[PDB]
Amino acid sequence: EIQAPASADIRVLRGHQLSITCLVVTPDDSAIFSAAKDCSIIKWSVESGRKLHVIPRAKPPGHSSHVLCMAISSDGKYLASGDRSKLILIWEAQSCQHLYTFTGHRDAVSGLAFRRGTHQLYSTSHDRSVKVWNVAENSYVETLFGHQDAVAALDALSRECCVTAGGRDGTVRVWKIPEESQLVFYGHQGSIDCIHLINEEHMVSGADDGSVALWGLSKKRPLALQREAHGLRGEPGLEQPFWISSVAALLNTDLVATGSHSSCVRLWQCGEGFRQLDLLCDIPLVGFINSLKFSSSGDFLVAGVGQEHRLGRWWRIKEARNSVCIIPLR
């Protein structure tokens, strides 16, 4: 089994001045990039917890508005960061040198993923579009349409395909790019706010009604759905579920992680055929869990925490720390 980590195990990296919005772990597991509502990007050493580089709020390169999303290529070469200025900035991940700025989105960039094994980048946006870029050639390829509202998130693995979470449109969409085809799955579970691939044929999503869903990429209804996955607050009969702010999966395994603002990160195991989600443990962690990523090794989980939700200022948890938390999974 996995030993349930406690506060005495969790390394809390401090330095962002406002809520963390997103992060990535480098493929080699040696570093973390995080971004926050302070508009900066920080590169951290996993091993020491020290800062390796800081890209400040921005004619030096950098972001003038919140970074909402980031992705790193599978060879570790490129970092992409997407912001509320409609921009995707591309960086040399080793040096943090700015390489390019992709323009073309008409509203905030809200999801990014590289196609594994390539330098092909997929983005999505509040402008309701999905875009395809080639980072090696600094080129724009094409735009795909279908979502009916601002898109919340995007993931991809090795196939020429991405999956998106439609937010208030209530859909998860599968974009089969060379096939010029689009599969639309209906969640019937409020706003679909986060998504992550588990393997090439399965994914996990989280919704603002508190539900966590497992999907097969070719079946139109969830294979599993865990209601109120982070529990409840409120009066008897009038309960309000904790909304799901982040989800992560450990590639090619049955391990999934979920985050809300319920004071814990939850680890789950997917049952045979992905037809059931079973809770493994609660990891104590106060605040908005705005980002979750497993290490490549699966030996640690990284959480991006904020006093506030990554998308707005509606709620503040004053007891939380705006931190990048390294959670060991032993």
From Swiss-Prot:
Keywords recorded for this protein, A-Z: Acetylation, Isopeptide bond, Methylation, Nucleus, Phosphoprotein, Repeat, Ribonucleoprotein, RNA-binding, rRNA processing, Ubl conjugation, WD repeat
Superkingdom of source: Eukaryota
Protein's cellular compartments: Nucleus, Nucleolus
Post-translational modification: Deacetylation by SIRT7 enhances RRP9-binding to U3 snoRNA, which is a prerequisite for pre-rRNA processing.
Entry keyword annotation includes Aminoacyl-tRNA synthetase: no
GO biological process assignments: ribosomal small subunit biogenesis; rRNA processing
Gene Ontology MF terms: RNA binding; snoRNA binding; U3 snoRNA binding
KW Ubl conjugation (keyword) present: yes
Cellular component GO terms held in the UniProt record: box C/D methylation guide snoRNP complex; nucleolus; nucleoplasm; small-subunit processome
Sequence ranges of the WD repeats: 15-54, 62-101, 104-143, 146-185, 187-225, 239-278, 284-325
The protein's role, per its UniProt record: Component of a nucleolar small nuclear ribonucleoprotein particle (snoRNP) thought to participate in the processing and modification of pre-ribosomal RNA (pre-rRNA). Part of the small subunit (SSU) processome, first precursor of the small eukaryotic ribosomal subunit. During the assembly of the SSU processome in the nucleolus, many ribosome biogenesis factors, an RNA chaperone and ribosomal proteins associate with the nascent pre-rRNA and work in concert to generate RNA folding, modifications, rearrangements and cleavage as well as targeted degradation of pre-ribosomal RNA by the RNA exosome.
Family: Belongs to the WD repeat RRP9 family.
Subunit structure: Interacts specifically with the U3 small nucleolar RNA (U3 snoRNA). Binds a sub-fragment of the U3 snoRNA surrounding the B/C motif (3UBC). This association with the U3BC RNA is dependent on the binding of a protein called 15.5K to the box B/C motif. The association of the protein with the U3BC RNA was found to be also dependent on a conserved RNA structure that flanks the box B/C motif. Part of the small subunit (SSU) processome, composed of more than 70 proteins and the RNA chaperone small nucleolar RNA (snoRNA) U3.
Domain notes: The WD domains are required for nucleolar localization and U3 small nucleolar RNAs binding.
Record's protein name: U3 small nucleolar RNA-interacting protein 2
Organism per entry: Homo sapiens
